[PDB]
């Protein structure tokens, strides 16, 4: 369960997300990693899934993000698709929706995704020989 291939699905998606630059990866999300984190693994997954759902919900049709060129629009649609895929996997791992996020600090989506990737790679490392 805790070392399920979902971890690989999450890292794969994060790898695509962080290789991605778009108009809006500099817009912010609540920094769940600014905590003196006193949180189970499941609550951290819930936390990350919550802020990302807020992000894609709010920015899927945002004029700063949608793009002028074909390439920009394609990259925006890919970003939203990947955030939904990441989120779907995170909720699967969380096993809950009740996890208030209290942090004041905001980070760019870019920085938040990089930190999440580091955390996920560490979990994978701890699962593997």
Author numbering: 1 to 129
Give the article text.
Interleukin 4 (IL-4) is a pleiotropic cytokine that plays a major regulatory role in the immune system. Signal transduction of IL-4 is mediated by a sequential binding process, initiated first by binding of IL-4 to its high-affinity single membrane spanning receptor chain IL-4Rα. This intermediate ligand receptor complex then recruits one of two possible low-affinity receptor subunits, the common gamma chain (γc) or the IL-13Rα1 chain, into the functional hetero-trimeric complex to initiate signalling. The overall structure of IL-4 comprises the known four-helical bundle in up-up-down-down topology, which like the crystal packing is unaffected by these mutations.
The structure of the super-agonist variant F82D shows a different picture; the side chain conformation, i.e. the χ1 and χ2 torsion angles, of Asp82 is identical to that of the wild-type Phe82. Interestingly, the high-resolution structure of variant F82D reveals two alternative side chain conformations for Arg85. In one, the side chain is not hydrogen-bonded to the Asp residue introduced at position 82 and is oriented towards the solvent. In the second, the side chain interacts with the carboxylate group of Asp82 via a weak single hydrogen bond, but it is much less fixed than in the variant T13D. The distance between the amino group of Arg85 and the carboxylate group of Asp82 is 3.2Å and therefore close to the exclusion criterion for a hydrogen bond. In addition, the temperature factors of the Arg85 side chain atoms are elevated compared to those of rigid main chain or side chain atoms in the variant F82D, indicating that the stabilization of a certain side chain conformation is not as rigid as in variant T13D. The model of the F82D:IL-4Rα complex allows us to propose a stabilizing mechanism similar to that suggested for the complex of T13D and IL-4Rα. Here, too, the carboxylate group of Asp82 (F82D) forms a bi-dentate salt bridge with the guanidinium group of Arg85, thereby immobilizing the side chain of Arg85 in the ligand-receptor interface.
